[PDB]
Amino acid sequence: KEHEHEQKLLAREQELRDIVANTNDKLIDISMINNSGIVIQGTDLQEALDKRQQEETNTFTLLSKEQLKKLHSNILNEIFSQSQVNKPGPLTVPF
Amino acid sequence: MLHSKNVKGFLENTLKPYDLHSVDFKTSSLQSSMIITATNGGILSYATSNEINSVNNLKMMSLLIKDKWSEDENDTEEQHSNSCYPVEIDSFKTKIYTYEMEDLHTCVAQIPNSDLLLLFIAEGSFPYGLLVIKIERAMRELTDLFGYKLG
Amino acid sequence: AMVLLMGVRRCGKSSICKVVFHNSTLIDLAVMELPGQLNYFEPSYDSERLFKSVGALVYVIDSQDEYINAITNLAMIIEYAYKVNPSINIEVLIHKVDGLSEDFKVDAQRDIMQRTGEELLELGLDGVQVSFYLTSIFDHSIYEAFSRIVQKLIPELSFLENMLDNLIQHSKIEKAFLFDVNSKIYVSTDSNPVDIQMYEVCSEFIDVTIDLFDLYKAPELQNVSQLANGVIIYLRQMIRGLALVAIIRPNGTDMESCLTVADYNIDIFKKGLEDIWANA
Amino acid sequence: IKGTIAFDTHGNVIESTGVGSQRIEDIGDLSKVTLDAEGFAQVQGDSLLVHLYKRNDITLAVYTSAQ
Ligand SMILES: Nc1nc2c(ncn2[C@@H]2O[C@H](COP(=O)(O)OP(=O)(O)O)[C@@H](O)[C@H]2O)c(=O)[nH]1
Numbered sequence: 001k002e003h004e005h006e007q008k009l010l011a012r013e014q015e016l017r018d019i020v021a022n023t024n025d026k027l028i029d030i031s032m033i034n035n036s037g038i039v040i041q042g043t044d045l046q047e048a049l050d051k052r053q054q055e056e057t058n059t060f061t062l063l064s065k066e067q068l069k070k071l072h073s074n075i076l077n078e079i080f081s082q083s084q085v086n087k088p089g090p091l092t093v094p095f
Numbered sequence: 096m097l098h099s100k101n102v103k104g105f106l107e108n109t110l111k112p113y114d115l116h117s118v119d120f121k122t123s124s125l126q127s128s129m130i131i132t133a134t135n136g137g138i139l140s141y142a143t144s145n146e147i148n149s150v151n152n153l154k155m156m157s158l159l160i161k162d163k164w165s166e167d168e169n170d171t172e173e174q175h176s177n178s179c180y181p182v183e184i185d186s187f188k189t190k191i192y193t194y195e196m197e198d199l200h201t202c203v204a205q206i207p208n209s210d211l212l213l214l215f216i217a218e219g220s221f222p223y224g225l226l227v228i229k230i231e232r233a234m235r236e237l238t239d240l241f242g243y244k245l246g
Numbered sequence: 247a248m249v250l251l252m253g254v255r256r257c258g259k260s261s262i263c264k265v266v267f268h269n270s271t272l273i274d275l276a277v278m279e280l281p282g283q284l285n286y287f288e289p290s291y292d293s294e295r296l297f298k299s300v301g302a303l304v305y306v307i308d309s310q311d312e313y314i315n316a317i318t319n320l321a322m323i324i325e326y327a328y329k330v331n332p333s334i335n336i337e338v339l340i341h342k343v344d345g346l347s348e349d350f351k352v353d354a355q356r357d358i359m360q361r362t363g364e365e366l367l368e369l370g371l372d373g374v375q376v377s378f379y380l381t382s383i384f385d386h387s388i389y390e391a392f393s394r395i396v397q398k399l400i401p402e403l404s405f406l407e408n409m410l411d412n413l414i415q416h417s418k419i420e421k422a423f424l425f426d427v428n429s430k431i432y433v434s435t436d437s438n439p440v441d442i443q444m445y446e447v448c449s450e451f452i453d454v455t456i457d458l459f460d461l462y463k464a465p466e467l468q469n470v471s472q473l474a475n476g477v478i479i480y481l482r483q484m485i486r487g488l489a490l491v492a493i494i495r496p497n498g499t500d501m502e503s504c505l506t507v508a509d510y511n512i513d514i515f516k517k518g519l520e521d522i523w524a525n526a
Numbered sequence: 527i528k529g530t531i532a533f534d535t536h537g538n539v540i541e542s543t544g545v546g547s548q549r550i551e552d553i554g555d556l557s558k559v560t561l562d563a564e565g566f567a568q569v570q571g572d573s574l575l576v577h578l579y580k581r582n583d584i585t586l587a588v589y590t591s592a593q
Contacts, residue, residue: 016405016522023409023518027416030499030507033155039163041178042195044223044539048550060555060571068566072579072586074117075532075541079225082113083232088104091239093096118530120543137502151513154506177536193538224533224540 099140102130106142109215109233113225122225125217126199127153132245133210136161160194160203160214167192168205180227184235191230193223202226204234209243247271247301247399252280252323254316257308258341258383265383266392266429272400273487273526274429284319287326294330301399302335303327309343309354317358321365328374335398336374338362339381339391351380386442389449393431402524406434409515414438414492417511418504420477422492423448424484427456433488448491451479470505478504482512486525490515528574531587545574546589556587 112124129141136158143149168190180191187207194201198219205212215230247270251259259279267274297303305320307313320338327334340358343351359378366374379391397403406424414422414436421444424434430449432440455469467489469481476496483489490512496504519525529544537553552571559578561567567578570592577588 016402019518019521020405020408020412022521023514024412026514027412027511028155028507029416030418030503033158033503033507034162036159036162039159039194039196039201041176041193042200043178043193043536044533044550045537045553047195047219049554052551058555059552060559060569060576062559063568063570065564065566068577068579068586068588071117071588072581075115075530075586076582076584078115078117079113079228079540080232082111083229085105085108085111085233085236087101087236088108089098089101091098091101091105091237092243093098095096115541118541118543120541135500135502137506148513151506151510155510158503158506180536222540222542223538227538228540 097139102140103142105237106130106140109229110142110144122221123218125215125221127156127216129153129157129214129216131157131161131212131214133161133205133212134245136212139211156196156201156216157214159196160201161212163194164192164203164205164212180231182231182234184231185238185241187241189234191227193226200226202230204230206234206237206240206243209241210245211240211243213237247396248275248278248299249302249304249395249399250278250280250297250300251304251306252282253306254308254319255281255283257306259306261383262306262341262381262388266388266431269428270526272396272426272433272524274426274431282319282323284315287322297327297330297334300334302337302395304337304339304395306339306341307358309340309346313358314361317361317365321362321369324366324371324374324376325369328371332373335395336376337391337395337398338376338378339388340378341381341383341388343380343387344382344384355380386446386449389430389432390440390445392429393433396431396433400433400524402522403434405522406524407437409518410434411436413511413515417492417508418495418497418499419508420444420493420495421448422490425449425452425489425491427452427483427487427489444493448479448493451481451491452489455481472501476501480508480512482516484516484519484525488525528589528591530589532584533587534584540584544589546587549589553587556585 106128109128110125113122124144127141127143130139131137132139138154138157141153178193182189182191189205189207191202191204194203199216200219200221200223201214201216202223203212203214213230213234215226217226251263253259263277263279267277305323307316324336327336340355346354355378362376379387379394381388381391410422410424413419421438421441422436423432423445425432425448430452432445451471455467459467467481467483471479478494478496480492480494481489494504494508529546531542531546532540533553534540537557539550542550559567559569561578561580565580569576569578573592575590575592577590579586
């Protein structure tokens with residue numbers, strides 16, 4: 001039975017070494033914070049281009065006004081209306 | 096001085112999503128909304144759309160965003176970048192930079208003539224132009240915090 | 247790991263118990279005092295289960311009084327203690343050494359060691375190693391002695407040493423201690439030597455934290471204490487009664503960035519400590 | 527109308543609906559297409575008619591079926 005305990009201790013040594021290695025792998029230093037490179041400038045067009053790059057000529061040929069003029073202005077107004085954030089009070093209080 | 100309750104309510108209000116009715120275009124809410132300093136990048140105030148681990152992760156992300164913004168603020172070469180949207184509101188000039196953080200769209204904008212930063216973070220499906228308009232109209236309403244410096 | 251406290255009357259076992267444990271395996275359990283006077287030991291008076299249930303035997307010797315008979319009684323105790331169970335760690339504390347010089351203390355410890363070794367040689371015991379500690383209530387010595395005694399009864403010592411070494415190497419920590427909430431008995435540390443002054447600083451930090459928390463109650467312990475030179479002292483309660491105390495130096499960096507990276511690293515360390523059942 | 531795409535002079539998406547929600551990569555090509563004084567345009571590509579309108583430096587791309 002003690003040989004089974006020896007195998008259990010060997011499994012304990014492997015598990016505890018794995019536990020040490022697992023918590024050792026998530027250690028982030030300040031050098032990792034300063035030179036991470038994760039925060040990169042990304043645009044919608046560049047994101048679409050990278051998506052097409054990972055997934056994988058002049059297509060457009062040059063040839064109502066009231067409806068488009070109404071809908072563009074209405075879309076802009078609906079975007080600007082919901083962006084109006086009213087404060088619940090003053091931000092800085094005096095003495 | 097400062098008031099934490101009003102700034103918290105303002106950030107909670109800026110966590111509101113968009114629901115367009117003329118065109119059926121539903122947008123999700125922002126992932127996180129917070130205000131950070133321009134010197135150390137620590138979180139002054141914050142608000143989440145939906146505990147300590149997430150706060151620490153948000154502080155780490157704020158530090159990363161401030162670290163990336165610090166070099167961009169002190170660089171004048173390649174100033175005509177397509178990801179920069181410098182707006183001037185009430186004769187106060189600022190620079191807005193958009194960033195991509197893996198699967199999260201993070202946009203930051205310095206509060207003009209002050210040592211504070213305003214940061215909006217959303218998911219990868221969120222459009223960047225809506226974020227720019229959102230943070231511009233948010234900076235339009237923040238006139239009382241203009242000219243505020245750390246003690 | 248129940249430790250047994252043995253000694254003559256008026257040697258200081260009850261006072262040691264009060265001072266340490268009143269101000270399982272690892273927690274500060276209710277230890278057992280045992281007044282052992284000079285007498286003839288009864289052969290196997292149902293004490294085999296008691297000594298088989300003791301993780302480590304601790305003996306207390308008063309340095310003020312004569313101790314040759316105390317060493318003789320200690321040898322008589324060890325004579326059956328090692329026979330019943332050959333895996334018991336035996337510890338001997340030389341108590342009440344506050345009013346002695348360093349040379350006198352070292353000479354007394356050497357004389358006690360030589361007498362115990364000669365008496366064990368006379369009794370024929372071999373393969374037994376007995377540790378000796380110069381302890382006193384009025385200073386840190388009893389805390390360090392109990393720390394060593396507790397550390398001898400944790401089989402996961404080296405893995406905790408490696409974990410704390412990695413935590414210190416990746417957080418600009420000067421010295422991190424894994425305390426317990428009661429008795430101020432630090433459980434694990436790094437490979438760096440245990441500085442007495444820093445240990446006293448961390449112990450009084452533990453006392454200040456617990457007292458200040460107890461002053462405001464009835465509505466996870468965390469504490470950050472920053473000094474004038476930028477040196478911060480951090481606290482975070484671990485699983486069960488364990489608490490982590492670290493001294494982190496800024497090295498000319500941002501305070502809030504250092505706090506954020508230390509918080510994230512220590513939370514990762516706590517998540518790793520959740521997997522190992524070192525608590526309680 | 528099959529979908530709408532809203533983008534400014536930088537070309538970043540403000541809104542993407544319909545087929546244009548999965549047709550984002552054409553903004554870089556459409557940034558070189560000339561307009562009129564009123565901002566309107568009718569440019570055909572991939573068997574679809576795309577209608578443009580630039581007002582306050584934002585070009586709204588609207589998709590309609592050619593057939
Ligand atoms: N100066 C000094 N006196 C001690 C120390 N430990 C115990 N004593 C003395 O021992 C007495 C109490 O002994 P006690 O604990 O009741 O003995 P026990 O009941 O046999 O364990 C007190 O009067 C203390 O003065 C010590 O570390 N330093």
